[PDB]
PDB file of C-alpha atoms (C1' of nucleotides) in Angstrom:
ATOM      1  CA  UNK R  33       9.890 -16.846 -21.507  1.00 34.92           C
ATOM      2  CA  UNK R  34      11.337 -13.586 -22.290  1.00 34.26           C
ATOM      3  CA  UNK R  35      10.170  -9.570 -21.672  1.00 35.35           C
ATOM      4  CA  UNK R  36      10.424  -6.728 -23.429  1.00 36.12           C
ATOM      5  CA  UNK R  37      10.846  -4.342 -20.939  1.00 37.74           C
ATOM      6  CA  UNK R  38      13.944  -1.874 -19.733  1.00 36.91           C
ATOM      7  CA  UNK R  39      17.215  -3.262 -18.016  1.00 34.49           C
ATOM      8  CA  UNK R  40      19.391  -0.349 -17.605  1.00 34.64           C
ATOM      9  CA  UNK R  41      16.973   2.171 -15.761  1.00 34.47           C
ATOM     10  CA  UNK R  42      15.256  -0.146 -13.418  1.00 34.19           C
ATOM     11  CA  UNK R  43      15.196  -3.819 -11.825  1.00 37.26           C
ATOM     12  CA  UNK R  44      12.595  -6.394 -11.688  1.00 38.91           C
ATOM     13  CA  UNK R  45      11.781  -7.586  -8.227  1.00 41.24           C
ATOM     14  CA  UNK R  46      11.031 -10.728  -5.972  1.00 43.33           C
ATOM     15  CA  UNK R  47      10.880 -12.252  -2.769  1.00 45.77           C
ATOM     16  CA  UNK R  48      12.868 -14.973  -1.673  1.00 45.14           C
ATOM     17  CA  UNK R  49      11.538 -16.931   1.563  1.00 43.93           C
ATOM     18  CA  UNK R  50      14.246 -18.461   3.718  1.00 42.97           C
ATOM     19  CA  UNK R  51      12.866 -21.028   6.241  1.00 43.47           C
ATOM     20  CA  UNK R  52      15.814 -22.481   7.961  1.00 45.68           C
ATOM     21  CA  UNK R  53      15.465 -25.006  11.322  1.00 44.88           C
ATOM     22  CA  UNK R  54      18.229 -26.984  12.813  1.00 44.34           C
ATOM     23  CA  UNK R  55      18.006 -29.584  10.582  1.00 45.31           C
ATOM     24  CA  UNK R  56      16.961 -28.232   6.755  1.00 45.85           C
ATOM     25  CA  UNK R  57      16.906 -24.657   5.462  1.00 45.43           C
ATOM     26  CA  UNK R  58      14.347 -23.728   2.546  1.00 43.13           C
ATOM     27  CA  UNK R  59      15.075 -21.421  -0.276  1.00 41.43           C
ATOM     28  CA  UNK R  60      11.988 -20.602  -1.744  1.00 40.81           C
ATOM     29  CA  UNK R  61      11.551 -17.530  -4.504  1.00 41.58           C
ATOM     30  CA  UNK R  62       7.803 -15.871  -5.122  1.00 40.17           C
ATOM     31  CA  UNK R  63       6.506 -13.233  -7.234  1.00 39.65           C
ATOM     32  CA  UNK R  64       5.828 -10.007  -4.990  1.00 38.19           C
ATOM     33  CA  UNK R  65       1.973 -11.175  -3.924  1.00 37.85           C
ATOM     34  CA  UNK R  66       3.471 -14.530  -2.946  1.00 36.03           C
ATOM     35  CA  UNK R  67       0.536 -16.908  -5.063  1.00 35.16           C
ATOM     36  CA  UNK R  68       3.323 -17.795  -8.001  1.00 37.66           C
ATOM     37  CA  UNK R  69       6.433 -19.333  -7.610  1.00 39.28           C
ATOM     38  CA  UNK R  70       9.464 -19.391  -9.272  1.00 41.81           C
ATOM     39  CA  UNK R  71      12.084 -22.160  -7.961  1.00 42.66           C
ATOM     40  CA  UNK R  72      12.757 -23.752  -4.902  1.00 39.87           C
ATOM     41  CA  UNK R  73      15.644 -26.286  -4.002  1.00 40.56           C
ATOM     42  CA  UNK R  74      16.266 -27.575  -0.430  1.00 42.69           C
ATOM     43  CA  UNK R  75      19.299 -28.146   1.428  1.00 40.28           C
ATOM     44  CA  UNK R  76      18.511 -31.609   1.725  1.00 40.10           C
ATOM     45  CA  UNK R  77      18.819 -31.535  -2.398  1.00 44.11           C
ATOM     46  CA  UNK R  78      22.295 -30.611  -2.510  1.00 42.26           C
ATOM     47  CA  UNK R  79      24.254 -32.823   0.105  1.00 38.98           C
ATOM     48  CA  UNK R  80      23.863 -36.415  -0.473  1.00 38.61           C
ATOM     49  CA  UNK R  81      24.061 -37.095   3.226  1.00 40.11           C
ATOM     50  CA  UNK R  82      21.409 -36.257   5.529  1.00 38.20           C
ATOM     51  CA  UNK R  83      23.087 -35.467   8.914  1.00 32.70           C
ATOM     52  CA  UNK R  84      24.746 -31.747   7.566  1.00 33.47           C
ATOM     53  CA  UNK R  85      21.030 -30.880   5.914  1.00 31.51           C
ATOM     54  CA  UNK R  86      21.602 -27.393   7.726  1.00 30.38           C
ATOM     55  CA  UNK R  87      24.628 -26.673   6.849  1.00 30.07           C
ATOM     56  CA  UNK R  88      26.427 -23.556   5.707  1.00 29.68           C
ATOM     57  CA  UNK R  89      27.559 -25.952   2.628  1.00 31.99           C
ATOM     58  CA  UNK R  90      24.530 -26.694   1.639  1.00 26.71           C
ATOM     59  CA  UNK R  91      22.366 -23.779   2.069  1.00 25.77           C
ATOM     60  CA  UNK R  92      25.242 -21.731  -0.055  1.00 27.08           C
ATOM     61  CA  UNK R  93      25.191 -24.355  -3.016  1.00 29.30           C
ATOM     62  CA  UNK R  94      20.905 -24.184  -2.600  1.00 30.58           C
ATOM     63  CA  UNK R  95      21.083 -20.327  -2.967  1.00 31.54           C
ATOM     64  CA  UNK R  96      23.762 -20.338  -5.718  1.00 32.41           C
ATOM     65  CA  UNK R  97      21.484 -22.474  -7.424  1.00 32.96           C
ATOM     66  CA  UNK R  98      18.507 -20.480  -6.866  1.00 35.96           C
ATOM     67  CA  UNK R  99      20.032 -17.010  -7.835  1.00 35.14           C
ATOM     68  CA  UNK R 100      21.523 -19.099 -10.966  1.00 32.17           C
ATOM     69  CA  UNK R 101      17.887 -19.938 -12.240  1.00 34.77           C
ATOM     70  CA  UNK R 102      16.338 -16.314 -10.698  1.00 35.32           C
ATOM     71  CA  UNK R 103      19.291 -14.783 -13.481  1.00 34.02           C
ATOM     72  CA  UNK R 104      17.958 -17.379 -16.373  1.00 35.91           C
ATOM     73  CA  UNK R 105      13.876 -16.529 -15.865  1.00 37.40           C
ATOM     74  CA  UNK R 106      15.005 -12.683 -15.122  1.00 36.07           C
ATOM     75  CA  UNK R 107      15.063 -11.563 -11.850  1.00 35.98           C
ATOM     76  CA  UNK R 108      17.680  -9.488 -10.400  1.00 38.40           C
ATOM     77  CA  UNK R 109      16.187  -7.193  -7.555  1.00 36.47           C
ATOM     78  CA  UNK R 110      14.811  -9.464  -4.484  1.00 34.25           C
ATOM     79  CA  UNK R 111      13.382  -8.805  -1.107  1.00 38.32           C
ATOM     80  CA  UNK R 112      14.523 -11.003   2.186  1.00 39.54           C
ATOM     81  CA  UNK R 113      11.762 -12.702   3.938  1.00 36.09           C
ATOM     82  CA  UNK R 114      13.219 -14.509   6.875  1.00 32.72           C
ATOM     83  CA  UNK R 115      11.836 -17.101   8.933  1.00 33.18           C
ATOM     84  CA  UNK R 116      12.775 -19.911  11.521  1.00 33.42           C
ATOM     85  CA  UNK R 117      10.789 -22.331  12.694  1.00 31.35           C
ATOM     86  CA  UNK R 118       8.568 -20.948  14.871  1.00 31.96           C
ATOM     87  CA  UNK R 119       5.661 -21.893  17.505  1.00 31.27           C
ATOM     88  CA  UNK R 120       6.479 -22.734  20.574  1.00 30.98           C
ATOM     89  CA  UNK R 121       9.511 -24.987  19.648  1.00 31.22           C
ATOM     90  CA  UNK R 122      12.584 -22.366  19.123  1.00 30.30           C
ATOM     91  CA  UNK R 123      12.813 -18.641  17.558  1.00 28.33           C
ATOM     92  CA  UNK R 124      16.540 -18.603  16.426  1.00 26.36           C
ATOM     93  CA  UNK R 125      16.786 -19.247  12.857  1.00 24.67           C
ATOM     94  CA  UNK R 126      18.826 -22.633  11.727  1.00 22.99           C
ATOM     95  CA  UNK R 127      22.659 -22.652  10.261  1.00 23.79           C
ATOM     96  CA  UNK R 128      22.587 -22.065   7.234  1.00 21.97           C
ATOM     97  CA  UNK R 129      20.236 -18.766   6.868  1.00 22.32           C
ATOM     98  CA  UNK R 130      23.355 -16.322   7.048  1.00 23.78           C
ATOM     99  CA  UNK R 131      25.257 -18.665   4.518  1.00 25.90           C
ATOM    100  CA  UNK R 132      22.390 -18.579   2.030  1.00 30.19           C
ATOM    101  CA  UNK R 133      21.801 -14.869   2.565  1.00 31.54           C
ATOM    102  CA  UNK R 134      25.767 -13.921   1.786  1.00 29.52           C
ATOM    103  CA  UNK R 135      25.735 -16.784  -1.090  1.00 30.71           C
ATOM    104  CA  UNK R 136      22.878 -15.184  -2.316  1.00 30.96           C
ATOM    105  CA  UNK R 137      24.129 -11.512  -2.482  1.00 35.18           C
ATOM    106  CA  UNK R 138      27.520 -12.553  -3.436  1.00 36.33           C
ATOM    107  CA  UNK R 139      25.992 -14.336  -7.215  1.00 35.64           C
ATOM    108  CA  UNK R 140      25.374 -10.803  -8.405  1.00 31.47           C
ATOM    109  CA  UNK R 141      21.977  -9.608  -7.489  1.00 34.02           C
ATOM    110  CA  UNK R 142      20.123  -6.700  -5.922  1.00 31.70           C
ATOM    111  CA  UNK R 143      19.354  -7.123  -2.216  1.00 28.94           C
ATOM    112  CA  UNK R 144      16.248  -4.917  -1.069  1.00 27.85           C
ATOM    113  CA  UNK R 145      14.670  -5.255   2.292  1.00 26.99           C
ATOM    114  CA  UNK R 146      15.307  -7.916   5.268  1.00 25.28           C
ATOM    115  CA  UNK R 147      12.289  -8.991   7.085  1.00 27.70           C
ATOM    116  CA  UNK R 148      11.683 -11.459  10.020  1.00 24.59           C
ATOM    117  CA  UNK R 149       8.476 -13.215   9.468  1.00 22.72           C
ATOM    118  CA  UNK R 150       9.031 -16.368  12.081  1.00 22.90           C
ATOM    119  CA  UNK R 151       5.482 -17.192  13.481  1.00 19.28           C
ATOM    120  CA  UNK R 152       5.489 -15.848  17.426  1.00 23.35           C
ATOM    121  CA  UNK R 153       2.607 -17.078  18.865  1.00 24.77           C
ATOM    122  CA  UNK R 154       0.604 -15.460  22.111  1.00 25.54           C
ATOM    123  CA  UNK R 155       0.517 -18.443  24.284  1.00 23.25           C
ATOM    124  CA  UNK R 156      -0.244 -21.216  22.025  1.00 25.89           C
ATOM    125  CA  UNK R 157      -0.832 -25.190  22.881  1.00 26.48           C
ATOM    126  CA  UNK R 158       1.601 -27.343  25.199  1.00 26.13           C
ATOM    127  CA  UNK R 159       5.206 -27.498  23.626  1.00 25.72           C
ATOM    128  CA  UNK R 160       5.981 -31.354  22.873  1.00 27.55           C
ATOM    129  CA  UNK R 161       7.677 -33.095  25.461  1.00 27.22           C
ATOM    130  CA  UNK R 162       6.989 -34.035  28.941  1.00 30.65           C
ATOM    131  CA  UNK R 163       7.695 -31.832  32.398  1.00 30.22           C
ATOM    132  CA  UNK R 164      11.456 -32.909  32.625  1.00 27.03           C
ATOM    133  CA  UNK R 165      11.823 -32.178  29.269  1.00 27.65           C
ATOM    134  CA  UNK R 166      13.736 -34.881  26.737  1.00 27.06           C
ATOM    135  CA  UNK R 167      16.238 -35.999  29.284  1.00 28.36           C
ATOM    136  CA  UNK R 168      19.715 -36.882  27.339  1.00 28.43           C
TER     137      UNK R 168
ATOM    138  C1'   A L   1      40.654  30.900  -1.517  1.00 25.77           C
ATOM    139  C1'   G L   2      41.878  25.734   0.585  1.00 27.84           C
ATOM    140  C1'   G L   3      40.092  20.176  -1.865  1.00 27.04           C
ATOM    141  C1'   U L   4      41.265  13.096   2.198  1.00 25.60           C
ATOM    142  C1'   C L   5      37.405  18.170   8.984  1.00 29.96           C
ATOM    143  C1'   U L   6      40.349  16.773  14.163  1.00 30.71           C
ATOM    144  C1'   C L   7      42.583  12.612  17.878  1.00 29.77           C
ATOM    145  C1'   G L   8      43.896   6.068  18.291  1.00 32.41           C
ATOM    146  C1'   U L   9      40.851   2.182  15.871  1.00 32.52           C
ATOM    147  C1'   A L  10      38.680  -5.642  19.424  1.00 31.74           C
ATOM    148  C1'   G L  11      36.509  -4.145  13.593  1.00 31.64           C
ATOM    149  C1'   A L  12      36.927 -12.064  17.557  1.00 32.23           C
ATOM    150  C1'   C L  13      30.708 -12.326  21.639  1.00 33.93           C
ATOM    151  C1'   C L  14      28.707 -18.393  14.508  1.00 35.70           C
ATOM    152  C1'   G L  15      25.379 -21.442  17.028  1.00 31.64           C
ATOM    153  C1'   U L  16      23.004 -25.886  19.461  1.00 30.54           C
ATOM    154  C1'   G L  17      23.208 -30.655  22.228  1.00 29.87           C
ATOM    155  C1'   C L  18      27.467 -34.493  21.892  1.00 29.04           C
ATOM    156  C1'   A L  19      27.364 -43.171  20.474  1.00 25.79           C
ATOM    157  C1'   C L  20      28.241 -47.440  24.214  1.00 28.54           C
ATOM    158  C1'   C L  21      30.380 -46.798  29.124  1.00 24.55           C
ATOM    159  C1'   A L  22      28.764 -52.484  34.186  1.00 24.76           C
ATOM    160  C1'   U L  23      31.377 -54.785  38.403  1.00 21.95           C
ATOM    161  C1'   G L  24      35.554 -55.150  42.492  1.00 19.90           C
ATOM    162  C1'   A L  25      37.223 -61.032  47.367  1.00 20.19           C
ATOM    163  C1'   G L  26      38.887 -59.380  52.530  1.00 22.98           C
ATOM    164  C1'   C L  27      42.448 -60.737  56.768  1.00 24.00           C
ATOM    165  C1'   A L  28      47.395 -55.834  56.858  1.00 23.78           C
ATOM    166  C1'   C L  29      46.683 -49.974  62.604  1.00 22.02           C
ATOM    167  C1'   G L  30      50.468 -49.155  67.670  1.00 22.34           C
ATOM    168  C1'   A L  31      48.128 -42.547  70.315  1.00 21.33           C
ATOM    169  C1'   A L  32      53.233 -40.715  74.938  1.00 21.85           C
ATOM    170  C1'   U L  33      57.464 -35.948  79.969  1.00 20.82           C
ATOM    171  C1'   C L  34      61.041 -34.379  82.137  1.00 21.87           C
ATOM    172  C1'   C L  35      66.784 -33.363  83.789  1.00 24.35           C
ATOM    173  C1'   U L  36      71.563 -33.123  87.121  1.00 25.38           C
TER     174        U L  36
END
RNA sequence: AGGUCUCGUAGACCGUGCACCAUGAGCACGAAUCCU
């Protein structure tokens, strides 16, 4: 596992995929066409207790994690590819994207660009629950 | 030739629902104008 290329004059790049809903965020790391990964650790892999899966705790200690092993393979430049969870159920993106993002330029890498990639749909199938809605 | 262009720096709109939560015996109440 090691390159002989130049450090000093350029950067090697990647994109990093962060899927955060309301209750997990993803922190997943590809090669630039997407097909090969690299490392991936959930939020539910950090915490030990499964009611803060999205939290800022745990999505920081997932993306620490992630830009430590991105540093030992040899990665340093990466490109932001963020997404919620989509459809028809919400469009905001979970609690713990924000956290990952700063944890993740904070460990010492190279941000490039930020991209929303949440799926928006053009009047897709009935949204699950009944006419009232969930009624709490 | 001068080597920090000028006048003060809300520069908080981080976010979302929120465990279980029922009932109450009736007797005890009367409605008003003017001075020697």
């Amino acid at each position: 596992s090691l390159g002989p290329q130049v450090a000093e004059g350029e950067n090697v790049f990647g994109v990093c995929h962060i899927f955060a809903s309301f209750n997990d965020t993803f922190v997943h790391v590809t090669d630039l066409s997407g097909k090969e990964t690299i490392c991936r650790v959930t939020g539910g892999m950090k915490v030990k207790a499964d009611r803060d899966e999205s939290s800022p705790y745990a999505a920081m200690l997932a993306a620490q994690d992630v830009a430590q092993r991105c540093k030992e393979l040899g990665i340093t430049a990466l490109h932001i590819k963020l997404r919620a969870t989509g459809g028809n159920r919400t469009k905001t993106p979970g609690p713990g994207a924000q956290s990952a993002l700063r944890a993740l330029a904070r460990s010492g890498m190279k941000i490039g660009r930020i991209e929303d990639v949440t799926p928006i749909p053009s009047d897709s199938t009935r949204r699950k629950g009944g006419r009232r809605g969930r009624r709490l």
